[PDB]
Design a protein around this ligand. Structure first.
Ligand SMILES: *CCC(=O)c1ccc2cc(N(C)C)ccc2c1
Ligand SMILES: OC[C@H]1O[C@@H](O)[C@H](O)[C@@H](O)[C@@H]1O
Ligand SMILES: OC[C@H]1O[C@@H](O)[C@H](O)[C@@H](O)[C@@H]1O
Ligand SMILES: OC[C@H]1O[C@@H](O)[C@H](O)[C@@H](O)[C@@H]1O
Ligand SMILES: OC[C@H]1O[C@@H](O)[C@H](O)[C@@H](O)[C@@H]1O
Ligand SMILES: OC[C@H]1O[C@H](O)[C@H](O)[C@@H](O)[C@@H]1O
Ligand SMILES: [Ca+2]
Length: 305
């Protein structure tokens, strides 16, 4: 049996909960694989100790979802000593870190694509719902719930949703912007604060870097009898799709957990086996990186998910 070690940065991150369950299903389907998977509890020091234990257990490959992307070098040094390949996933290491080890790879996404898709989606629905322009000024007055500062996905999604709207000729006015750390309850608290402050009556659209935060904003809006205010997210979590159906969420963007899990597993198993990382697959590895496309989701294409 081939042991593959996996660390998830935090098991109850909504998106990574989808990913980790999908990786488990891929490993279950492979009778010659034993998956050893750990919750790093959002602490890189815990993750580093977990990696020492996996290496002591003789894993033949590691799939590592970093707590801190800057720790890629620490992880590579541990793996290099045992000649163990590492497939990083979802939290992207630096190019220099990836280039420093011939058996380091990365599976994730092109972060800016999700911001562009989210902006193009907001533009489509704004055009179709001009009653959303509450002050009738032709500009979107928005609030934005940001992910973890410095996370590539949060930074790109925040920058490019606005750039895409503005590039399409839709002026935007930022009424509030703050992190809610990718968390539903923190986002509900932040949105409730904004609905209790002087810009409450001016908010026309809520933009969130992920669905967990969008769902918190949806809850705060319901509590203030403002469910007419549209909310946009990213991930297309199974639970978020239900709100797209009900109209509680105006739109989101599929972050393709099943294919990111599959590519992570396929590459780790090939490397454990001493094969080329993409051998026998159709994964496109570009300079040791696989990026899985995002897809915009709303009521019009909801049935396809
Ligand atoms: C977007 C998810 C993410 O990267 C992230 C990172 C760090 C944290 C930290 C906390 N606390 C210290 C409470 C909460 C959520 C996080 C999400
Ligand atoms: O669901 C898993 C999570 O449970 C929480 O109760 C712990 O505080 C986290 O460290 C852990 O990652
Ligand atoms: O903090 C991220 C996630 O943590 C989980 O424990 C909670 O159930 C989610 O509601 C939350 O979004
Ligand atoms: O100020 C009180 C408010 O705090 C927020 O954190 C909660 O999400 C709301 O439910 C609550 O009404
Ligand atoms: O229905 C959703 C679709 O709407 C289209 O207009 C957008 O261009 C797509 O990105 C999106 O997937
Ligand atoms: O690294 C974890 C993060 O990955 C992606 O950015 C997901 O969109 C987000 O939901 C998740 O919190
Ligand atoms: Ca307006």
């Amino acid at each position: 049996a081939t042991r593959i070690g996996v660390t998830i940065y935090k098991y109850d991150d909504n998106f990574m909960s989808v990913v980790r369950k999908a990786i488990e299903q891929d490993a279950k389907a492979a009778p010659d694989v034993q998956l050893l998977m750990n919750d790093s509890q959002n602490d890189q020091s815990k993750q580093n100790d977990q990696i020492d234990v996996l290496l002591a257990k003789g894993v033949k490959a590691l799939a590592i979802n970093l707590v801190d992307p800057a720790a890629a070098g620490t992880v590579i040094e541990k793996a290099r000593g045992q000649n163990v390949p590492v497939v990083f996933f979802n939290k992207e290491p630096s190019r220099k870190a990836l280039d420093s080890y011939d058996k380091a790879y990365y599976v994730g996404t092109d972060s800016k694509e999700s911001g562009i898709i989210q902006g193009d989606l907001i533009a489509k629905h704004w055009a179709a719902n001009q009653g959303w322009d509450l002050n009738k000024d032709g500009q979107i007055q928005f609030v934005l719930l940001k992910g973890e500062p410095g996370h590539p996905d949060a930074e790109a999604r925040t920058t490019y949703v606005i750039k895409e709207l503005n590039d399409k000729g839709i002026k935007t006015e930022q009424l509030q912007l703050d992190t809610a750390m990718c968390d539903t309850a923190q986002a509900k608290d932040k949105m409730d604060a904004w609905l209790s402050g002087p810009n409450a009556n001016k908010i026309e659209v809520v933009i969130a870097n992920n669905d967990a935060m969008a769902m918190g904003a949806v809850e705060a809006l319901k509590a203030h009898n403002k469910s007419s205010i549209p909310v946009f997210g990213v991930d297309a979590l199974p639970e978020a799709l239900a709100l797209v159906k009900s109209g509680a969420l105006a739109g989101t963007v599929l972050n393709d957990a099943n294919n990111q899990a599959k590519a992570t597993f396929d590459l780790a198993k090939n490397l454990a086996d001493g094969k080329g990382a993409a051998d026998g697959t159709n994964w496109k590895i570009d300079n040791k990186v696989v990026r899985v496309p995002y897809v915009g989701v709303d009521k019009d294409n909801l049935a396809e998910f």
